[PDB]
Assembly symmetry: C2
Homo-oligomer: 314 residues x 2
Amino acid sequence: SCKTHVLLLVLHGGNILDTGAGDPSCKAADIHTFSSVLEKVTRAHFPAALGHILIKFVPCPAICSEAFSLVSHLNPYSHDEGCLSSSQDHVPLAALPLLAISSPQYQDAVATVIERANQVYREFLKSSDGIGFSGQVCLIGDCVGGLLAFDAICYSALGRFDFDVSDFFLFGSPLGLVLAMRRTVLPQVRPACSQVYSFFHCADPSASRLEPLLEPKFHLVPPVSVPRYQRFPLGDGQSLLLADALHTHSPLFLVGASRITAKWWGSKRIDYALYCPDVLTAFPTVALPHLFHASYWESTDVVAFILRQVMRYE
Amino acid sequence: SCKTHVLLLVLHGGNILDTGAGDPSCKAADIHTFSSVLEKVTRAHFPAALGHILIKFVPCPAICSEAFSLVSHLNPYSHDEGCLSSSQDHVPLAALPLLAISSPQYQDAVATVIERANQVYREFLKSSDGIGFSGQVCLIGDCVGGLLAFDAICYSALGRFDFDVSDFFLFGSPLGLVLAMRRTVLPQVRPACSQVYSFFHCADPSASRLEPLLEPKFHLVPPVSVPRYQRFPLGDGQSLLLADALHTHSPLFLVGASRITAKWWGSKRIDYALYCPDVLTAFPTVALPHLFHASYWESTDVVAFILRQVMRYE
């Protein structure tokens, strides 16, 4: 009945250097660009999806504001008020998410995200495109929004989203570092979703693997290489299944297989490395969080990958 | 009576990438190199100090071991067991001190350092060089040892050192980042010493200013430039006093002057930037913590500076 089969809900929190009140047009511009890539890839190769996948977004609070001010005041190099210096090659970017999630007010940002996402979902259900919706809701979190999205669906084994999450995609999010901090302070939390797919460019300062936090020996298993759309528009035929990694690397892991499988966040691999044009690596450190953030919204590699995953429901 | 007028006690904890049991000969080699620089500068320009300044060291625990393992397992790049990859330009070095001090066992490392320092001090007092000692004890902390040394002398306004600390020198220590984390979680702690001098090379990944944590507008006052011994073996004649910075930058700060002066850690500036040979900047990120760590023990710039400070007691 309903024309929308899959709702892609984007939790847009910006990147680790964003501060203050965001520009709402900037968030909408990101989503418009992403939506145009989705439509183009859909027409070229997934015509059965045309008109059936809808994108909505949720603006998240900029939880790195105070952390940015502290890091900027720690900078040994000369700089102007409210600024970093591009000469600081090793600006401590990894401290920004850690300071952000350590704030006593971080939990309030999570509660706010849940409230805004439920309002967006409810308006969708009343809209013409949402009447009679019975499909899948996938979550997409950007660099910072991914952190909030994860904490919003996590449980042990503030309210809650009004929907059940199927696929959960993370765009260059430093979640791994955050979870390493939380394990250090308080030494299983798992997300309530059908699968986690965490994308990163290896050279992104926020690139953080999650698989070795579930099973440490995965640090010796390479991340999955996402196929370049230009060469493999239909994918490269790889199964993506955890069981294939366990089977191929059985000496490393193998009760072993069942214990790892039980604690995994889905039946597929979690760590996905994206092809990184060499141009992106020619920039000073302070420019990289925005450049990597912006890359996702126009990535045909990422969009084609997402589309392939939502076809087991067709 | 006693031939030793100043005891320089070095808390040697290594750098943020050190793990496991240290090589004791390595720590002793560092201290021997430092001691030889001290003797050479002393003979050239402080002959009244010859034979009257003694160096002792205290090996500290390698509190970054577990953090190193986590960061190494987060690395998106291919690497070997127990290793970082030099291709990871933005390895999250800033996470290492933060994970280290967040461990529930960090407080036990501080207690252990206090115990070992008191044993070293007691053996010194029994030695021929220490009988009748009535002089000053200065503390020197290296990158990691500085963190432990600071927490050992801090109080609000585990045991304690058996001595009172005069000057406290920090060699490229990420204390500022640690204190920014602690202020974020629990939003005055001050060290029990006559003065803090925190040295850094601007390009050192652990370089972190402390002055803006005491007074935020100091982020717009440059750190003090340490004179190069090659050109200014006797110093450049600068007072180093906080009051001179407040006076010269009075519009920024000025009850203001008295409140800032009261919360400062001594009467002198705290942030000291060292000249950095360009060679040190030609190295990949994973090599920099050791290279910067090693630089201090052979630095005539640092040694001449230290010697000038211990002359107000002559």
